[PDB]
Each structure stands twice: as C-alpha cells, then as structure tokens.
Amino acid sequence: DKEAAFDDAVEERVINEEYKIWKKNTPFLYDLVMTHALEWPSLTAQWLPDVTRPEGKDFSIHRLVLGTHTSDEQNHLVIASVQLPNDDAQFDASHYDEFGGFGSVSGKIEIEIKINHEGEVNRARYMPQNPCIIATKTPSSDVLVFDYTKHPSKPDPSGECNPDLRLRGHQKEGYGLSWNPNLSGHLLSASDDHTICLWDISAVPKEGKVVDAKTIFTGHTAVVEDVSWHLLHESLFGSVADDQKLMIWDTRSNNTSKPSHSVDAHTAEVNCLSFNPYSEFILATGSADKTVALWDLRNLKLKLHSFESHKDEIFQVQWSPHNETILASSGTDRRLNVWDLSKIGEEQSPEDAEDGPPELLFIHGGHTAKISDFSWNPNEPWVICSVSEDNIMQVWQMAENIYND
Amino acid sequence: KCKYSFKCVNSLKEDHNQPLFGVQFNWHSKEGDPLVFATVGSNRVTLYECHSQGEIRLLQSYVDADADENFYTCAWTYDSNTSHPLLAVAGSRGIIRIINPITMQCIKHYVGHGNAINELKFHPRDPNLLLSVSKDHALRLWNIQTDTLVAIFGGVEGHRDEVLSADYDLLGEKIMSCGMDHSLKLWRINSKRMMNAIKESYDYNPNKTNRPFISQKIHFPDFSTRDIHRNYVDCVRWLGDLILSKSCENAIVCWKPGKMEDDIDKIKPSESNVTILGRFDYSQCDIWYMRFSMDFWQKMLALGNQVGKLYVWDLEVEDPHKAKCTTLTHHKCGAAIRQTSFSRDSSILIAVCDDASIWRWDRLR
Amino acid sequence: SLPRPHDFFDAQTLDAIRHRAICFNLSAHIESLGKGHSVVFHSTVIAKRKEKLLLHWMPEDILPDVWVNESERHQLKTKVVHLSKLPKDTALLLDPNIYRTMPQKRLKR
Amino acid sequence: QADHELFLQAFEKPTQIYRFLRTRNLIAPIFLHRTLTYMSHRNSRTNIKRKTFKVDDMLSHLQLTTGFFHVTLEVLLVKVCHKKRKDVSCPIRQVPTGKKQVPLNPAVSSNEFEHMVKSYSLLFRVFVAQMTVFDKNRRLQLLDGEYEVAMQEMFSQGPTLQFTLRWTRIFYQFLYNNNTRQQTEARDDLHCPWCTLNCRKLYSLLKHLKLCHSRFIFNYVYHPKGARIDVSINECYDGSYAGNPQDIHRQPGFAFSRNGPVKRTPITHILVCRPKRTKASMSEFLQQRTYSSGHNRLYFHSDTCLPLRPQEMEVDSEDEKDPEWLREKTITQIEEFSDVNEGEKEVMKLWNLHVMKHGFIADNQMNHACMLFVENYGQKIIKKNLCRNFMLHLVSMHDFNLISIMSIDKAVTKLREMQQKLE
Amino acid sequence: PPATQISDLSKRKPKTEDFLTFLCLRGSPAL
C-alpha cells in the first residue's frame, strides 16, 4: 500500500541517519576502520591465511575473498589483497600519506585475480589446508570451484569462464557452503531445496568439470540456510533450517534422514549455526525468534543464557577462535552482536542491566542492508571481515581495551 | 464589436501568497465533465475545481518546500494507456515533475537541464512528447513514455542564448522557438531524421542497450531570423501557416517566413528576408516572461496584462485582425496576470494573478 | 566551501515522525508522566477480587495488565514501567516505525 | 513576537528534527554504551578474565459462575503471537465455547491452556467483553476473586456477569549556528535530555554527546557548580546517502527502492588509522585526513548532465576524430562557393571530408593518401562522372609537391578500372 | 530557570493537543 511504501521510505531514512551516527564511533570502539565498496556487490566474505611481513615494509600481505552478486554483466569472482598496520601502526608518524605502518596508498584494495563466473556468487568458502582452491555457490544446480593461480588475471570482455571443477549436486538455488579445516576437501552446501548436500572434494580429479554429490542430507522439513562443521571434531556437523530445529548431524552415522541431535532449540525459523574451537561446547545458533541461544554439547536440553538482543532472523553466527568465551552472530537485523560468557548469570549494576544483558558484550551496527557474511581473521586478533547487500565489505577490529586488567 | 461576453463568476486565493506564473486549463476533458484547472506558484502547487452558479471550490493542493524549489510551467497533458490527466511543473532546480491528481503522487522527475525550465508544451498527435526549453542556452524534447531525451535542439548554430519560450505548429510538423538572443530560429521536425529518431525513441529501451540513447544534436536550424525582434522574444504561436510571436514590444507580430508567394514548406534554409503582415497592439504590457494562450477554435486569442486588464482577439474574420475588439476587467484585479487559459468549449476563461488568485469568467454562450 | 549535498533525511519523514510523536504522547504520556525514561499509564478497575482489584491499563501491547490488592490498588493505582523493562514481544506492536524490514519482501534467502 | 516568534519557529524546526532523531534512539539503541572506552564512568563493572569457559554451569481448575445488571452468551479466546517474517501481523486463533440460557437480569474452567503462543487470553460476549487474562510480560493476572466483569459497549456500573474466578548543577544552552542560547537544567545524574542515559560523571557525558550524537555538536565548557554544555547543529553534516550514488538521481518510485542488485564503481575507505589509547585530558574537552581509493561517486556524460552509469565506461570516449557538425560545416562551405564547377565542387568536398576524417599530417603519407580514394570512393566518382576533375586535381600537385608523376599515373590507371567496369 | 529541561523543551515535538497541560500548555516556547 501507499502507507507501507511511505513507512519503508521513512525506515530507510532512519537507517541512513543511524549509520551516519555509527560512523562517528569508529576510533573509540575499533582499532581499524577499513570499508571497501566492491564494484560487483558482495554476497560473501572470507579471510585467506596467507601472510607476509618483509623488511622495510611493516605491512602483512592479507588476502580476502570478495564476491559478485549483480544480475548479469560478465559475472566475475574477485580476489583482492589487503594489508595490516602491524605492531608499528604509526597512525601519523609525521609521514602518513602509503602510511608509516602499512600500505595506505596505491594498492590498498587492489584486485589480484578476477576469474569470470556464471551467475551469482553466494559463498566464497576456501580450503584452509590448500588455500589455492575456492568454492562458490550459484543459482544453478551446480557449484563452482575456481583457482586464482591457474586462472589468468585481467579478465577479457567476455564471460562464462570454465572453472574446470563444477560440483553439480543441488537442484534449486543454494545459500550454504563450508569447508573442513581438519581434513582437506569435504565441502558441504545447504540449499533452498529442504536439504544440505556435501561433496568429497579433496583429491578432485584433474579437470573434473562434472562432479557428483558425494552425500546429501535431507532431514529438515523446511528450507536450510547454513551448514557448518565442527572445528574440534571433524566427524560431525550441524544443519540449521527454517524448521524449528538447530539439528546437529554426525557423519558416517548411516542415517541421512534423522539428525543425531534433534533438539528444537527454538520455536521459530533458524538460519545460522556455528561453534568454537577453543570452547568446543560453546555453539551459537541464529534464529527468527530473535533469541539466539548458546548450547552445550554435553547438556543440550537445558537452555543456557539466551542472548536476548536480536530483532529479526539471524543468518550468520561465528565465535572467535583465538579467544575462549567470545561468540558472535549476525542476520537480517544488520547487526553483528558479539556475545560473552564471563558476565553470564552474574550480578550487575542497574546501568549495565539497562545497557542490555551482561553476557552480550559487543554489537556492531555498521550495516545498511542485510548482513551477508562475517568472519574473524585467523592471523590478526580482533580483525573481522563483514559484508552486506549494499556492496560494502568491512574490515575492522574490535577494541581489546575492555579485556584489560 | 466582438460577439463574446464573459462575466466573472467566482475567485479564490492560495495559502502561500506568492506570485503565480503558469496556469492552463484541461482541454482534454470532453463534454459532461466539469471544468478543472490548475495553478502554480512558490513551492506549493494548487489545483481547483469551480462549479456553476458562480462557485469556485478547491480540490487538491501540494507542496514541495523540502528545498528552495520553485515552479514556472503548468502544461496540461494526459496518459493514453491510463486515461487520467497529468500536470507538468518545472523550475528552479529544473526538475520536471509529472503530478497525478487522481492518485495524488508524482509520477516522474526529469533532470539534466543546466538551469531552470522556462516553458513547456505538449505535442498534439502524440501526447507523450514534451517540448522543454531550458535556460542553459538549449532546447530539448522529452519522451514521457520512455523517459529519454529525444533530441537536443541547439549546438554549433543553435540557441546562442537561453530559450525563453517555444510553440508548436497547428499540425505539429514545424516547431518555433523564441529566445533571449533576439532570434526566432526554427527547427523543423519534418526531416526524415526526426521521424527516425522519434520511432527509435518509441521503440527504445535503456535497460536493453548498454550505450546511452543517441540523441540527435540539431546544430544547424532549418530557418532562423533576427531582424523581426529588436529585443528578446518570450512568446510565440502558430496562426495556421503564419507566426504570431510576441516579445517585450507590447505587440504580437503576425508574419510569414520568406517572401509572399513562396510556399512555407518549400522555403530554402538560405532565405534571409522576412515580411510583416499583422501586429496586434496594446499598452502597459512591457514585462518579461508572460505567455498567451489562444482558443482551440482560433477565434479567440487572449493575453494577460500586468496592470490587471485582459484582452481578447478575433482571428477568423476576413483579412487579419483589425479594429479594437473588447477588454475584460475584474472588480478585484490589482495584480499582474501571467497566463490565461480557455476551455475546449469557448465558455469558461480563468485568469491568474501575481498572488495565485484565480479569477474565473463565464461566457453567455 | 561546498555546502551540504542534500538532506536525505527529514524531507518527508518529518511529518510522519511528528504524527507518531503526537500519538505516543497522547496515548501513553511517556514524556508527560513517565519521567522521560519510562512508559506512564492510567489504570481502570476492570474487575476486582473478594477481600482486591484488577487495575487494567489502557494502552494495549504497551503497558501489561496485572492485579493489585485493594489497598495496593487504592494506593498505587497508576504504575509506570521502564522502557527497557517493557516486553520485547509487544515492543513491535507498540509502534511500527521503530524497526521495519525493507528488503525482506523478496530475495533474502 | 512577530519576527521574534518567526525566528523561534525557525529555531525549533531543526530542534524538532533533532528531537525526532533522538526519540527513535531512545526506543532502540544501536550499540551498547557499556563498551565505550572513553565513557568509562558509566557501567564501570569489574573485569575478571579468569572465568574459564569450562565452568559455565557455575558461572550462570476454577469454579466460576447470573445475568447482566442495569440472553445466551458465549466465551471466546483472543491470542496474540510473534510477528514472523512470513506473516506481518500476529496470527490469532479463536476457540469459542457454548451458550446457556442464563437469566436476563435476575462455570467450570476447562483445560484449554497448558511456546509458539505468546500468551493466552479469554474474552466474553454478552454485546462484547474483552479482558486481559495475561499480561504483556507474562505477569500474573486474572487470579482468584469474584467481581462484576464489566462488558465494553459496542466492578462497574455497566452490565456485568458474576463469575467466581479462581486459580488457574548541570546546564544546557541550545544554539543554532550561534544564533541564540537557552537555559535548561538536568533531571538525573548526567542524564541526556534527548535520550535516557545515566552517565556516572562528565567523562561518560561529554564523549557520548560529541560522538553518539552526530546531528548536533557540543562545546563543553565546565561549570563551577556542575557541567555547562552548549548544543548546536553543525552546518556541514555530511550525512547524505551512503549507498549507491546511482539511486540518488533515479526516477521516483524506483530510487533506493531495493528492487535488486545495482552495479557500482570500486572504492576503498580508511578514516581511523590507530587509536592512541591515551588517558583523560581536560584540554580535549576544551585533523581526520581520511584515506580513500578508487571511484566513490557517480559520473556524468560530457554532452549533457545525464548521469553516466558505471556500465557505460568500457570506452565512453565521447571524443571523435572528425565531429559531425564539422563535416556539415565543411560541406556547407564547399557548396557556398561561387567560382567553382559542380564536379570540381564535389571532388574538393570529397577530398576535404576525407582529410578531416583521416587527419593526415605527414607529408610523405600524403602520397599514400592519393591511393585511398581508389580503395573507397572510386565508385562515387565513376557514377557522378567526375574523372576529368579528379585528374585535374591530381595533376594540381607540383605547386605543393604531395607525391609525383608516378603516383598520378598509378591513380589514373587505378580509377580507369572503375570507369570501364561501369561501362 | 524552567526547572527540568524536558518539560520546557521537549514539548516542541508535541506542539498540538497532546501536551498533557502542565508547563507545556503555558508559555513554554515564549517568555
């Protein structure tokens, strides 16, 4: 209706004003503020583990996998390289321009390899064991696996580049993908066709254009939105779908219909799931009920401190690997809330209660559209790469001053 | 001496109390539908709907006071596939807004002009073509259906200065254009290239093509003249095959291009002599940016005056206009009239003032 | 220097914001009797208990309705609730302009 | 009054805008103020990181009952649910009951209850009666106790049915570009008059006002008794649209409508290099130099003010070797001659147009130029029968070099093929 | 000194018949 359109316009105006307000709290809450606007709109993010800090160049060679989610103009797959201020940050150093601590000019966000894609790029999950290979999800029934080394750079004015490795196991459009850090290969994808499909990958055949699905997990009644493995144990993973069940499935269980863990864990739609390597028991999951709840593997029936801070469906959750009791979540409410456990179930001052739950520690509000993906940096302590639907990729580090003394 | 007699019926005023420039009737309303007219002024545009028995009522009002906006033109048109009237307003920032009173919401905005739009007219055969004369020393033709710039009239030898106003021929084949360069240069739309461009714009799709629409820059006009008007010209009409352009000389000269016996459609571009045939003379009409609108039947031509008087003319009797005709005076006419509009049936005439105070008249009929 | 580009906000949303503020102030008196940081209300005796009273509160989905003893009702008939203490489930129903999902109509999943 | 009143209204309008901006922040904050390092006065909770993640467990029937006083009646249930994504409004399920011939102006509770449903409520119909059985916060309500349950029109004096219900010195100075000031006090300890925030001291107040409120700026000056602040909105406020600039000039009904993905130019932004993590300083209360790369704006065409799309950038040269108006002017100038021949005029026009279209400047290349006509324009000369004029012009070279006799012979022989081919 | 800032200032957003009387209904915008 006309009133609905006017309300949406007012909402967009207020979102813009809130984002403008949030931009001002960059230094007092973050260590670095790096936001890059990709030409092709970003739908996913990742952090390559490559690093290089040469003498005389204090920056570290950091690579991040961007995305491409425009309708159809020679669809690509962007891979760029970024830097880091390092210990010698040198904010001014009387010579900042590149800066005195890292590259602040010329190739700040320069693109290294741009392999052409066929359709849309949903996820850009790579294999940490062999960072050369990168998998992609497309609206078609097949997945795309590329290689930024073998494929030439400087794309020609053409399209439909052959990735030499297409994983065709799905039926409808997909939106999930995850690799196995423990074992090279073993990529699984959760799609919209009420199921999650996994590929063996690993030692894929040379020029393996046609790749069938090694395994398919069809146990959720409603549409799935994420599928993530377990860092500590590679023999199980969790499947989360719109059906009110953040199910966890153990691999090699000879049961593709009944998940090992069948606890509902919610009364509404659920669209996110992840765990923590340092804290194996900690496992945050996102949901439409705006009540993302931490769970323990040993005791899942009992409900721990449900972080009552979301306001919409949550599509992406991830706990910080380096720390011990740090978790985070993001979804359609365009907020990246970072949880905490030390303050959970403990007394607090009335101001702390007014600010929110003590367990909720950090919340990131630097998005205008729905959050597509977010991930911590394996090398840097607090650097996080979060992306939205407004073709904005954000690289920032949560301030560690709160964890002082 | 004339056979017409209009009488004042009703009048009103606007909330914003600012000068009103452009006022036109809804000629596209057929019989049975009561007359409806619009008016502009300041940052708040207003409509009106006056019934019989000397009663005027307000239908709708709008406002655009978000920024320092202004409005000058109130060209009337309609949508063929929708069949609701539309009103065109532009100025200040130069954005052309197509207001839809039926749904009470703007339909389209046009940007690209280097300054404020001064006048607007609509093409008779195809009601979706708008003649926009911008102040950036150029004139442009807009296709409303596709929202594309059909042609940019002006260039190497076109529109040395701002084009104040422009008109259309009776059949829509030849286009006149006055301006501030003391020039009555003319751009025909009769060339085969004009037809090709119009057809391409009709079957154009900006989404389909990556390249921008190839507008036809008509640098060289087909016919231009300077000697007719010593000063800048701000009004022009097409009395059949003749020209009824008007300037600040308190006269609307009725002239014909070229010699006497030569056909107008066969005039060579190199012609450099003009002849004057008619000239309607009044007084106290030396202000700038004021427009006149004649009746559809061409028997009536009216031009508002700054003092407050009104003039009507007879343009159908044998030989060009002569004698003195008659003048219409209102009891409460104190401001400056900037535009006048008749109805499709020659029975209703409304004159706007410099305070958005419409004065509707009615003929005996 | 170059002036501000344009006021993206408050072009037309200002009137809607004013209307919502007027409605909230009239209905709840949050800024009138709620001290500026809590939701005020006026309760009426919807029912009672043999002895108490049921001092139901007028703003639905804004101020929850509870029970009060006869002396308790007669003394604290009016109850003011802190905004962060307000229920989150009915927060969306309290006002529709606090959070609206624009791109959730299509795409999304 | 009058002019003063108009100035007061013109001051209140931006003040009103700031008020509406601040009201929404009150209802739903964006980020926690606890984690504001500079504003450490508020939420100064103790920090103990020794709490390991292994120890989360330790760390954490009614007998009711007459008639209306001043007719079969039914009792229905009204349910409110959570606003899901699929359904904008909360689904409602109705579970009515039977009717009995109760006297006109003279019950046992069922196990319908006992977490999709937010709450359970019951409403009477005797001709309607809505009751709040459960609170919005799931608080205890509708407990034991009998009274006159009044029915809403369309205990109380209105009609009711008897039922035996049972269990189950801080100062401010508002300004506008230093126009005029104001005198306003404070209510709570370092409370912001715009939004509810209980700051402990001025450290958590001034920093929050400067950073968390970008709409208006502050000039903290301190007071002998409390804290004195000045409130005013800065002129610049670069808070325009932060998304795709392409949607800024889009047509109404489609701008920022979020219909689908929109292509744009690449850009990178850096504005916070490294916080100094310094200490509190009074002089702070009493440059940015951001880093950007790539294209972060929307470009325009050269010919007019039409916005240049990012896709319209592959070539987009808009710079031609020989513009069309130049060709038209050259043709007009050639045709305007009075002492030239028709075939001569045609051949000179052709040569001038070819020179303009090719832009030959090297002297030796001029020789090769005489060949080009034969490759391209020989058919026109043959059809127009301008061979003699061509030969005369070609011979008219020695006055200014431009090839020699051999080239003349070669070209004349070459066009001889066209004339004989046509013949 | 109009006491609490809210009651004398924040009445500008509700500038209609919703000020709940008090000092807002009085000459709060003026002197």
PDB file of N, CA and C in Angstrom, chain B residues 332-361:
ATOM      1  N   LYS B 332     -11.864  43.053  -8.783  1.00  0.00           N
ATOM      2  CA  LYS B 332     -10.765  42.927  -7.834  1.00  0.00           C
ATOM      3  C   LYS B 332      -9.481  42.494  -8.529  1.00  0.00           C
ATOM      4  N   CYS B 333      -9.170  43.117  -9.663  1.00  0.00           N
ATOM      5  CA  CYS B 333      -7.957  42.830 -10.422  1.00  0.00           C
ATOM      6  C   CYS B 333      -6.927  43.910 -10.114  1.00  0.00           C
ATOM      7  N   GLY B 334      -5.946  43.572  -9.280  1.00  0.00           N
ATOM      8  CA  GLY B 334      -4.908  44.515  -8.915  1.00  0.00           C
ATOM      9  C   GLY B 334      -3.506  44.025  -9.213  1.00  0.00           C
ATOM     10  N   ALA B 335      -3.340  42.709  -9.314  1.00  0.00           N
ATOM     11  CA  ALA B 335      -2.032  42.109  -9.517  1.00  0.00           C
ATOM     12  C   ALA B 335      -1.741  41.983 -11.013  1.00  0.00           C
ATOM     13  N   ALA B 336      -0.667  41.276 -11.352  1.00  0.00           N
ATOM     14  CA  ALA B 336      -0.232  41.108 -12.732  1.00  0.00           C
ATOM     15  C   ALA B 336      -0.610  39.715 -13.216  1.00  0.00           C
ATOM     16  N   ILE B 337      -1.339  39.652 -14.325  1.00  0.00           N
ATOM     17  CA  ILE B 337      -1.725  38.372 -14.909  1.00  0.00           C
ATOM     18  C   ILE B 337      -0.563  37.837 -15.732  1.00  0.00           C
ATOM     19  N   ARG B 338      -0.171  36.590 -15.463  1.00  0.00           N
ATOM     20  CA  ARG B 338       0.940  35.978 -16.175  1.00  0.00           C
ATOM     21  C   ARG B 338       0.522  34.911 -17.174  1.00  0.00           C
ATOM     22  N   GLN B 339      -0.714  34.426 -17.111  1.00  0.00           N
ATOM     23  CA  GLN B 339      -1.191  33.477 -18.104  1.00  0.00           C
ATOM     24  C   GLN B 339      -2.711  33.443 -18.082  1.00  0.00           C
ATOM     25  N   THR B 340      -3.290  33.114 -19.234  1.00  0.00           N
ATOM     26  CA  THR B 340      -4.728  32.964 -19.387  1.00  0.00           C
ATOM     27  C   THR B 340      -5.009  31.678 -20.147  1.00  0.00           C
ATOM     28  N   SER B 341      -6.129  31.038 -19.822  1.00  0.00           N
ATOM     29  CA  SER B 341      -6.489  29.776 -20.449  1.00  0.00           C
ATOM     30  C   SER B 341      -7.986  29.731 -20.712  1.00  0.00           C
ATOM     31  N   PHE B 342      -8.354  29.277 -21.907  1.00  0.00           N
ATOM     32  CA  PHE B 342      -9.739  28.994 -22.246  1.00  0.00           C
ATOM     33  C   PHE B 342     -10.033  27.513 -22.037  1.00  0.00           C
ATOM     34  N   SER B 343     -11.306  27.160 -22.148  1.00  0.00           N
ATOM     35  CA  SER B 343     -11.721  25.767 -22.141  1.00  0.00           C
ATOM     36  C   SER B 343     -11.850  25.261 -23.574  1.00  0.00           C
ATOM     37  N   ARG B 344     -12.036  23.946 -23.707  1.00  0.00           N
ATOM     38  CA  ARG B 344     -12.225  23.367 -25.033  1.00  0.00           C
ATOM     39  C   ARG B 344     -13.467  23.945 -25.697  1.00  0.00           C
ATOM     40  N   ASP B 345     -14.559  24.044 -24.947  1.00  0.00           N
ATOM     41  CA  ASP B 345     -15.728  24.796 -25.378  1.00  0.00           C
ATOM     42  C   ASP B 345     -15.565  26.238 -24.923  1.00  0.00           C
ATOM     43  N   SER B 346     -15.746  27.176 -25.850  1.00  0.00           N
ATOM     44  CA  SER B 346     -15.455  28.575 -25.563  1.00  0.00           C
ATOM     45  C   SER B 346     -16.503  29.173 -24.637  1.00  0.00           C
ATOM     46  N   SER B 347     -16.517  28.731 -23.380  1.00  0.00           N
ATOM     47  CA  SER B 347     -17.467  29.229 -22.394  1.00  0.00           C
ATOM     48  C   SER B 347     -16.844  29.612 -21.062  1.00  0.00           C
ATOM     49  N   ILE B 348     -15.657  29.109 -20.725  1.00  0.00           N
ATOM     50  CA  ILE B 348     -15.022  29.372 -19.438  1.00  0.00           C
ATOM     51  C   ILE B 348     -13.618  29.905 -19.686  1.00  0.00           C
ATOM     52  N   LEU B 349     -13.278  31.011 -19.025  1.00  0.00           N
ATOM     53  CA  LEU B 349     -11.935  31.575 -19.078  1.00  0.00           C
ATOM     54  C   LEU B 349     -11.519  31.984 -17.674  1.00  0.00           C
ATOM     55  N   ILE B 350     -10.314  31.589 -17.271  1.00  0.00           N
ATOM     56  CA  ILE B 350      -9.789  31.879 -15.941  1.00  0.00           C
ATOM     57  C   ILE B 350      -8.446  32.580 -16.084  1.00  0.00           C
ATOM     58  N   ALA B 351      -8.275  33.675 -15.347  1.00  0.00           N
ATOM     59  CA  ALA B 351      -7.049  34.464 -15.377  1.00  0.00           C
ATOM     60  C   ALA B 351      -6.395  34.401 -14.005  1.00  0.00           C
ATOM     61  N   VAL B 352      -5.090  34.141 -13.983  1.00  0.00           N
ATOM     62  CA  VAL B 352      -4.330  34.052 -12.740  1.00  0.00           C
ATOM     63  C   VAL B 352      -3.659  35.394 -12.481  1.00  0.00           C
ATOM     64  N   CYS B 353      -3.413  35.715 -11.217  1.00  0.00           N
ATOM     65  CA  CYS B 353      -2.763  36.957 -10.822  1.00  0.00           C
ATOM     66  C   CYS B 353      -1.403  36.651 -10.200  1.00  0.00           C
ATOM     67  N   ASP B 354      -0.751  37.701  -9.700  1.00  0.00           N
ATOM     68  CA  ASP B 354       0.563  37.567  -9.080  1.00  0.00           C
ATOM     69  C   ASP B 354       0.442  37.186  -7.609  1.00  0.00           C
ATOM     70  N   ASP B 355      -0.708  36.620  -7.225  1.00  0.00           N
ATOM     71  CA  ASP B 355      -0.899  36.112  -5.872  1.00  0.00           C
ATOM     72  C   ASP B 355      -1.622  34.768  -5.877  1.00  0.00           C
ATOM     73  N   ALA B 356      -1.589  34.048  -7.000  1.00  0.00           N
ATOM     74  CA  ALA B 356      -2.285  32.769  -7.155  1.00  0.00           C
ATOM     75  C   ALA B 356      -3.773  32.908  -6.847  1.00  0.00           C
ATOM     76  N   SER B 357      -4.354  34.025  -7.270  1.00  0.00           N
ATOM     77  CA  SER B 357      -5.769  34.321  -7.064  1.00  0.00           C
ATOM     78  C   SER B 357      -6.475  34.175  -8.409  1.00  0.00           C
ATOM     79  N   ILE B 358      -6.970  32.967  -8.679  1.00  0.00           N
ATOM     80  CA  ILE B 358      -7.615  32.687  -9.954  1.00  0.00           C
ATOM     81  C   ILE B 358      -8.930  33.446 -10.048  1.00  0.00           C
ATOM     82  N   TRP B 359      -9.177  34.054 -11.206  1.00  0.00           N
ATOM     83  CA  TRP B 359     -10.425  34.756 -11.496  1.00  0.00           C
ATOM     84  C   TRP B 359     -11.081  34.064 -12.687  1.00  0.00           C
ATOM     85  N   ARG B 360     -12.080  33.232 -12.408  1.00  0.00           N
ATOM     86  CA  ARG B 360     -12.793  32.522 -13.460  1.00  0.00           C
ATOM     87  C   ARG B 360     -13.890  33.396 -14.054  1.00  0.00           C
ATOM     88  N   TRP B 361     -14.025  33.342 -15.374  1.00  0.00           N
ATOM     89  CA  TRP B 361     -15.074  34.045 -16.100  1.00  0.00           C
ATOM     90  C   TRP B 361     -15.954  33.023 -16.816  1.00  0.00           C
TER      91      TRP B 361
END
